[PDB]
Design a protein around this ligand. Sequence first.
Ligand SMILES: Nc1ncnc2[nH]cnc12
Length: 262
Amino acid sequence: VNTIIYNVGSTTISKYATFLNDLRNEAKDPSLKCYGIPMLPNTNTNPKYVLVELQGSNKKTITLMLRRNNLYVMGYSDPFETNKCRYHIFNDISGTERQDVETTLCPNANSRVSKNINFDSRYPTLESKAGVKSRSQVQLGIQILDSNIGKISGVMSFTEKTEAEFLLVAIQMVSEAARFKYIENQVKTNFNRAFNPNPKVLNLQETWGKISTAIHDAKNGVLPKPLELVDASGAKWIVLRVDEIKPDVALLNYVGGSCQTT
Ligand SMILES: Nc1ncnc2[nH]cnc12
């Protein structure tokens, strides 16, 4: 398991681009790719994970554990108390993967402490815990991410709301950005300020699975069937070809079988 380190407390759009670039290259399958878009690996491929160390301001850090197969954030850890490593597993992680999260994040069996995330990683759950109707109401931003890291890293207790806000921002600025070039660019355009994710970033997030399947199954650049997405204004957007959606996509979800690689 390789860990990607990203300094949030002090960065540039150039550093953010490099970070996502390293993550994409670490997560992706060495050869799997459809229409020039790299695809995530089969669940049998090792390693199965990749860590993302987020270095915030005032020496506050949080490490994210991501499954390479689908780029989901399975949990995170933070330096705690003296020399402890506190791991937080998502409620929706089951079986052996739960031990993988604990032992992967905090390799030292002697100093690790547990503080489970008592809810799943689905957006509607996170939104509900955050106390909002939609994550569009939750502003993203580098200083916001930095600020949320400081509210959790090394802090004994913290509200489910506080935790959900961090997860919302971190998942979008880390996992969603790595998957979509469009989302990465949205962060870069508003790099020095806070912003509300638009109808297109949120729709892209919610349709990644469908998009990945449509591109994998596309014949000579033609989607199996018309794909109904939505643009930044909030208008319906019917994509008919790979060429129409590719510009916004950096990584494809793992989709079984062969596809046109280039
Ligand atoms: N925890 C998570 N990480 C990445 N993508 C997600 N989509 C829904 N939950 C997610």
